[PDB]
Every structure is written in C-alpha cells, then in structure tokens.
Amino acid sequence: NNRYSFIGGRTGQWQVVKIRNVLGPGLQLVEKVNILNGAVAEIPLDSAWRLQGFASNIRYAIRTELEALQAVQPMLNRAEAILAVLIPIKKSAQWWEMAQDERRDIFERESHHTAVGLEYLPGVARRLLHCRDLGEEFDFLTWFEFAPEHSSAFNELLLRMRASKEWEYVEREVEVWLKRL
Amino acid sequence: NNRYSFIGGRTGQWQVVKIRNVLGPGLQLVEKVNILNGAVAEIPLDSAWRLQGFASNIRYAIRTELEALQAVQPMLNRAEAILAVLIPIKKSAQWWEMAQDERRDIFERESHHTAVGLEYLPGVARRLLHCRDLGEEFDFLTWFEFAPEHSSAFNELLLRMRASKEWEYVEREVEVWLKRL
Numbered sequence A, B: 001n002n003r004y005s006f007i008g009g010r011t012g013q014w015q016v017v018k019i020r021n022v023l024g025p026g027l028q029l030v031e032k033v034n035i036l037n038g039a040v041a042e043i044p045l046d047s048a049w050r051l052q053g054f055a056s057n058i059r060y061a062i063r064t065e066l067e068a069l070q071a072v073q074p075m076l077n078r079a080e081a082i083l084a085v086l087i088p089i090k091k092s093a094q095w096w097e098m099a100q101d102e103r104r105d106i107f108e109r110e111s112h113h114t115a116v117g118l119e120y121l122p123g124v125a126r127r128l129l130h131c132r133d134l135g136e137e138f139d140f141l142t143w144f145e146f147a148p149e150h151s152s153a154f155n156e157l158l159l160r161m162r163a164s165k166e167w168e169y170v171e172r173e174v175e176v177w178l179k180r181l
C-alpha cells in the first residue's frame, strides 16, 4: 500500500511534544498521532483530525541528485531516531499552474532544496507523501525523524527552507513535533 | 472534482464501437461507457469494469511547449467531436524507478511526444488522467475525441507513438473506441 494516514487523537505510536502553527489555519493539539499504512474512511473516536497521502514517483530530482542522496540518506526506524516531525504543506495556485521547467528552476536552481537538504544527512531521515491529488486541504505530508542530538540542526534547516524562493509559494504550514512511544 | 470514473456496461453517454486489446490483458467488451465526474465505490449493476483517474499538474511540458499547446488545442465537447477513444496505459517498473531528467529525455528528446502530438491538433481534443497513485491496474487513462474526418489521422498518430522509444516502457494498453449518443 502506498497510502498513509495520520490520526491526531488519544492513541497512537507517537506522542505529541508540541504543534507550531507556522502559516495558515493550524491543527488542534492532541496527545498522540496514530500512523496507518492504508486509507481510513471511519474517523476514529476521540480523534481531532486525519491527514493522508501517498508515496509516489520522483517529480524533480535528476539522476546525479538521486545518486548523491542514496549514498548518504538513512533508513526510517533507526533505533536512535526517537524524535519525529510531521509537516503538512500547501502551495499556491500560482505554483501549480507553472510549467515543469519553471517549477524545477525554483526548486533547485534558485532554492537549492536538494543541495541544502543533503547537508542535514545522515542525521535526518525523511519521507514525502503527496495529497493534492486526493482533494486534501494540504498538498504534501513531510515526515522527518532523527535522534535528539540533531534537533538543533533540524531547526536550522527549517529556517533555511523558509528563506528560499520556493517558500514564497507556500501558503500553509504546520509543524507537528513527536516522540516515539 | 479532479476525479473521473469510466464504467463499462449497459448504460452511459457513449456507445462502444470496438475494443482493441493492444498489449497485455484486455478489457471485456461492453455496449456502453458511463462517464462520471466523481469517485464510484458502488460497482454499478450489469457493469463489467470500472476505470478511474484524477486530473493533475503538468509533469514534463515546459513553458514554451505549454504555449504552443494553448495556441491550438481544442476544447472538449465540440458539436462535431462525435468519435472518442479511451486508451488506458501502464508503464514498466523500470520506467517508474528512473529519475526526472531520464524520463523527460525519453519522453521529448528521444520520442518527441509533444512535437508529434501537436501535428494532430486541432482535429484531436484530449484529456489526461493519472491513476498509478490510486493503485489502479493502469497508470493512465487517456481520452481523445474528434470528428470522423480525423479518424484516419488519429490512427496514424497511434502508430507513430507506438514506434517511439517511450513506448518500449509500455507494458499494457487497450483502445476503447466510442461514438457519442
């Protein structure tokens, strides 16, 4: 199954440490996030919100970037990676109507997304889910996990991404910080 | 709603003229195709199959290409566009694991998909839907409609595309030919 669901409420494998409502309407604070590998139609009881998305193909990265990533990126579920952060993102209509060279140019040529992210590996593990195509309120679910040593660096990465040209198209962002139970 | 459904069976706005099972397991012949702008979970009565897909953002076209397309491409549902073809396509795992530069290059640099397709406009109208990300048996549903004067041309276009480098990655294909009721 390529589909993943995230349920904020009273049960799950993860404890909510905090939520930061960076841009746009926020998400309700909950005790726990429950993560599931499947679609969930039936909104669980005592649950405040459901996010979902799917794992998909590469949209921007070129072969050499892929090779560079594969050489250093960590797997998910390292025993040390007890902190995680879920970050939903929505981009503007003006971004989606742009052609594929335009978007590519803003993503790497101008914003150096891949080159910047590479500096935070192997400390940081990541997964990217897509959800615009499902009718969701957000366009993406981003997932990051790392050992506590790396929390500082991760915060530094967030402030850099948000200073890029790419982030000018971002109209909605929440940080859900988590601790593995 | 970005989601479109196509049910083969005994009702619909389109009459099946023929089905050609070009490559891989085919689709059951039926009398009609019903086309709905939403999901359909409830497998309709006396229906052989259901295909679905969503409209999405541009994946390969650059700005200059988009501009050429917009100069000439016809709208859907022109009075004279009484013939239609629905063509589901699946591409190989080996296609999907390639990077974004690699697929772009096979699609345009080697195959000239857009340049070739542009020679058949404005006779031919088209819609493109994606469905690998939904877990369908096909990766894409393609939709073409035109007046009968353009049938022979459309047939020439199919044979050109299928000789392309792109089409070496196609592992499943069906043409469903239709007539508007």
Ligand code: HEM
Pocket: A057, A058, A059, A060, A061, A087, A089, A113, A114, A116, A117, A118, A120, A121, A124, A126, A128, A140, A142, A157, A158, A161, B100
């Ligand atoms: C930690 C190191 C990071 C690396 C190595 C990295 C790498 C990448 C790469 C290579 C892609 C492109 C995937 C593709 O071609 O389909 C991507 C996409 C994305 N990344 Fe990152 N990333 C990192 C961190 C982050 C962070 C912190 C955020 C947001 C807070 C983020 C948000 C995104 C988004 C939203 C996309 C999808 C872009 C789109 O389709 O418009 N990434 N990331």
Ligand code: HEM
Pocket: A100, B057, B058, B059, B060, B061, B087, B089, B113, B114, B116, B117, B118, B120, B121, B124, B126, B128, B140, B142, B157, B158, B161
């Ligand atoms: C009639 C003129 C045609 C034009 C102008 C045309 C144009 C295009 C364009 C510009 C794209 C890229 C969309 C994007 O960047 O997201 C595309 C994708 C596609 N076209 Fe065509 N097309 C034509 C005919 C056909 C035909 C006859 C077929 C199949 C029999 C076909 C199959 C496809 C498929 C499968 C894709 C998606 C490729 C992918 O995302 O991997 N096209 N078409």
Ligand SMILES: [Cl-]
Pocket: A126, A127, A128
């Ligand atoms: Cl990823």
Ligand SMILES: [Cl-]
Pocket: B126, B127, B128
């Ligand atoms: Cl289209």
